[PDB]
Structure formats: C-alpha cells, structure tokens
Amino acid sequence: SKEYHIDEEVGFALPNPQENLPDFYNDWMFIAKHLPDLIESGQLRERVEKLNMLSIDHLTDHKSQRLARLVLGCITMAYVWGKGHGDVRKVLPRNIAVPYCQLSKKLELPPILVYADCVLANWKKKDPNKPLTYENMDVLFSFRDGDCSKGFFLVSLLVEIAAASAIKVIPTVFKAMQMQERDTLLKALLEIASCLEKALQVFHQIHDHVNPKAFFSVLRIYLSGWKGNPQLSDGLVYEGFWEDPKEFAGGSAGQSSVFQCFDVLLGIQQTAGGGHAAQFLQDMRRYMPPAHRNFLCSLESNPSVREFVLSKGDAGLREAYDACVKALVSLRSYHLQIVTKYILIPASQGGTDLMNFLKTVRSTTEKSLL
Ligand code: HEM
Ligand SMILES: Nc1cc(Br)cc2[nH]ncc12
Question: What's the gap in Å between 331 CA and the centre of ligand 1?
Fold first, then answer.
C-alpha cells in the first residue's frame, strides 16, 4: 500500500509518534503536559488567554505537524469545555485559534481534535525494543486525572492495530479476483476474517483499564464538539480566522479508517442510505487525514468482492466471505455491550439515538451475509 501512508505494522496508526516538539513552541507543550493540574486549579482559562500568535513555518517533518495538531487539539478542548461542567467558552482566542487553523488546513483537516489526533498519534512504547501492548505503551496526553484516556485511547489504539494485520491482505484479494485464482482468494478472506476474530479479545482489556462512571462523566465531555451540541448551538468562534462561528463534529471512532475500509471491501454499503447512520460516517470521512481518505476512495473504485462471490456459487468463498461479515457483526455486538455498560447504565445515575445509530449499523452489516 504505496503513499496511502499505511504501516505494514500498525496500519492506519502513526508509527512512533513524535514525543516532543521543537523548542520554538514550548509554552504550547507545557499546557498540553499539565492539563489536569491546570484545568482543576482554574488558571487554565487564565493561562491560555496569555499566549502569542506563533507561526507554523518552523514545523517541518510530518510527525511534528501532527503532534502539534494533537497539542493544539486537546488545549482547545480544555479551553472550550473548561472543568467539564457547563461553563463553556464560545470563543477561542485570536492567538491560539489562528496557528491551530493554519496547522489544520495545512493537513486538509478540520480545526478540532479527531481520532487520528488522539488515538493514532497520542502514543508511545514504554520500551522501544519490547512489543506494542498495554503494559509497554502509554499515552502522551490526558484531560483530567482519573479519566482513563490511557484505557480509552490505548485499548482503542490496540484494536486498530489488530485490524492492520488484514490491511496488507487487501492488495492480494483483488489480485486473486482479477487473475482469477479461486484458491488464493479464499485464503485472503480467511486471513482477513482471522484478524477481526482477534481484534475482539483486544476489546476485552477495556474492562481491566476503564471505569463506566469515569468514561461517561469525565472523558466524553472533553471529546464533544460543537455540531448539534446545544451548549454551543451556533458553533465556536475561531478568532481572527472565521468571524462566523464554525460547527464541527466531536471526535468519534466514526473517523477510523479500518472498519470503514472493511465495510468498503466487504461490499457492505454503510455510506449509501441517506439515513442518519450513513449520512454521518460519510461526513466523518472529512475528519480523517487525506491519505487515509484517498485509500477508501481507491477501494470503492474496486469491483465489489461481494458480487464476485455471489456469482461463483462456490460454497467455499460463500463461507469465507461470510466469516468476515460474521467477524464484523461479532465486534459491533460487543461494541453495543460496552456502550450499555459505559454510557446507558451510568446515564441513569443525547442517549438512545446513539444506540439506534449503532444498531442501524450492526444490521446493515448482517444483511450482507449470503
Ligand atoms: C468505553 C468505550 C467505548 C464507548 C463508550 C464507545 C461508544 C461509541 C459511540 C456512542 C459511538 C457512536 C459515535 C459517537 O456517538 O461518538 C461509537 C462509534 C464507534 N466506535 Fe465506539 N465506543 C467505545 C469503544 C470503542 C473501541 C474500543 C472501538 C474500536 C477500537 C470503537 C470503535 C468505534 C467505531 C469504529 C465507531 C464508528 C463505526 C460504527 O458506527 O460502527 N469504540 N462508539
Ligand atoms: N466518540 C469516540 C471517540 C473516540 Br477518540 C473513540 C471512540 N471509540 N468509540 C467511540 C469513540
């Protein structure tokens, strides 16, 4: 997978993110690295105000611009959401909202934190000679002490890596189909299935490393955005950049390129529908890189691997391809069992509309089994 920026190890995730910035930018990174101690102690929406309009010009290699977008990113979430209890800033200062929106529009992205910012870039290996697990990794950044953003981004990150096992497989699937190689292809769809059958046991650590209460009450509030949120019905001013408030999505895994690519591949049309479910995940393609866009693009340009299985009436492929769509339902049936532990049960101590979405989606998967 050429200039699609796909790692043959961590896939869509960014490989060995930058842990540190240039020195030209050290009063960014000092906020960013003491956001709990500072939000709490109130001087954060006093310390932010008192900064000056830096310029992107210095940021050279990728990882820099990216980590830079992470840093600006969460600082915006602390400034806007405050202590995370309802005193909401509807104005992002001239001075923080101009290098953030340049650094963003440099990377064809929107000025707000995303999936690729705070799961795909926000990580480091504790020892860069052992392997990528929970016990040998740590996040760069967090919002408040005891929010578990270790558990969230790390577990969430770990999975996207278990799907990468199957991304290096896509190249060979369509090869088999073209050169017509019934055998070769049946394999690729079983490897592809084999991975997501495992990216499930990944998901299980969530229960070891996150707390229902902490995720519903703490994290979530800082991840929200200003699109259809009612605390900022009109959006968020971006000072000396848009005199008009600008709505933007919260941060969702609806911005992840794996899953979205495996629906593309497996002929499951989650984008097509006009329904709320499918309108969203199309408008989240925006909140994804460009290079991870143009890969879901070149997939959808590909001949439906579903059709080519239906035809052949070859109960082998018929079965192997169902293994992949069995795999994907399996996972979103878990991802609903977590959401009831981690958003519904606590909310009883917006709501539903979230689960309908997540079911609307489990379903459209199912209805592609042969
Ligand atoms: C406590 C943990 C989690 C909670 C509360 C949660 C909740 C949600 C919610 C409410 C949505 C709907 C979009 C939104 O409202 O933002 C969503 C979408 C999504 N989540 Fe999760 N999730 C969790 C863990 C994970 C993990 C570990 C993964 C994968 C690594 C994941 C992958 C996704 C994906 C891919 C979507 C969008 C695709 C779709 O709609 O099927 N989530 N999640
Ligand atoms: N809303 C979300 C934000 C982030 Br980052 C990751 C996620 N996983 N599942 C949901 C969700």
Answer: 11
